[PDB]
């Protein structure tokens, strides 16, 4: 048993991280087949980052301006292309460690693992969730750009995120692997604010189910509620509205625990109105919303604890 914020094994992603240097700017790149993907602001310097015209800056560079290092091996850039906010550097060598992969754009409320890299060398891995305002609460320092977020379906790496910048509130923003930003953010050092964040309700309910599968049942109650009366309380507490599709997604967890979804919503309503009164759920004193129903099933279905 037990429940932890679990990241996917990073071995298949570690073999694709490279270091991309353009002038004095150095960041991480994703080496898949004979293409290296990296944030396009590697072509900028300190005087450019306020408001750079990236097409102007890119046309002033050629293939020899990009130094790509894969460990101690240097890759020759034989072609370059800008795809929205990411650079696509064609190199002379196909990555022999290239796993089967896909480029997917995830939804708010979904999770993924982050491999934080510095100078093409991975240093840590952790799980992240895309907030409803298209930000993530990660851990990124200088030189961490090019770090990728990913999920592993079976043997196929689903790349979904590339890190680009940090907002003034401490949250982080980036793009998918096609260069399209998550949210209304742009890769320039101007005053940018994320939208008002909300709590992912379906994730909280799945996390409550994980507590019951692990034997934390003090929050359960005899009450039940309608979906509309729950959504009325969810709005007051800045929770996303619960849909009928969310209830269907929580179906497998509802059957394994024997607790109806609307019964669990009545427990969440009491937790929202009353609080926890000093108690904890799965070792946490607040309601967690960074666990998807998939994350719970993958960690808790081999348990009963009836």
């Amino acid at each position: 048993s037990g429940f932890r914020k679990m990241a996917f094994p990073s071995g298949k992603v570690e073999g694709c991280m490279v270091q991309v240097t353009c002038g004095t700017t150095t960041l991480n790149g994703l080496w898949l087949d004979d293409v290296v993907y990296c944030p396009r602001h590697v072509i900028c310097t300190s005087e450019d980052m306020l408001n750079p015209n990236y097409e102007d800056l890119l046309i002033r560079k050629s293939n020899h301006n990009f130094l790509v290092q894969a460990g101690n091996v240097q890759l020759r850039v034989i072609g370059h292309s800008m795809q929205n906010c990411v650079l696509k550097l064609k190199v002379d060598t196909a990555n022999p460690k290239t796993p089967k992969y896909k480029f997917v754009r995830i939804q708010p409320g979904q999770t993924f693992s982050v491999l934080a890299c510095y100078n093409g060398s991975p240093s840590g891995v952790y799980q992240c969730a895309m907030r409803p305002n298209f930000t993530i609460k990660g851990s990124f320092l200088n030189g961490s750009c090019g770090s990728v977020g990913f999920n592993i379906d079976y043997d196929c790496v689903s790349f979904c995120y590339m890190h680009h910048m940090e907002l003034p509130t401490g949250v982080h923003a980036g793009t998918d692997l096609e260069g399209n930003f998550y949210g209304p953010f742009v890769d320039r050092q101007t005053a940018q604010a994320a939208g008002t964040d909300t709590t992912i309700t379906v994730n909280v309910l799945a996390w409550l189910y994980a507590a019951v599968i692990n034997g934390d049942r003090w929050f359960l109650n005899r009450f039940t509620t309608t979906l509309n009366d729950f959504n009325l309380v969810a709005m007051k507490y800045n929770y996303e509205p619960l849909t009928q599709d969310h209830v269907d997604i929580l179906g497998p967890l509802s059957a394994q625990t024997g607790i109806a979804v609307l019964d669990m919503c009545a427990s969440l309503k009491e937790l929202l109105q009353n609080g926890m009164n000093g108690r904890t759920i799965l070792g946490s004193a607040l309601l967690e919303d960074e666990f998807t129903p998939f994350d719970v099933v993958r960690q808790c279905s081999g348990v009963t604890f009836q």
Partner: peptide
């Protein structure tokens, strides 16, 4: 305010 990585 936003800082590029």
């Amino acid at each position: 305010x936003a800082v590029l990585x």
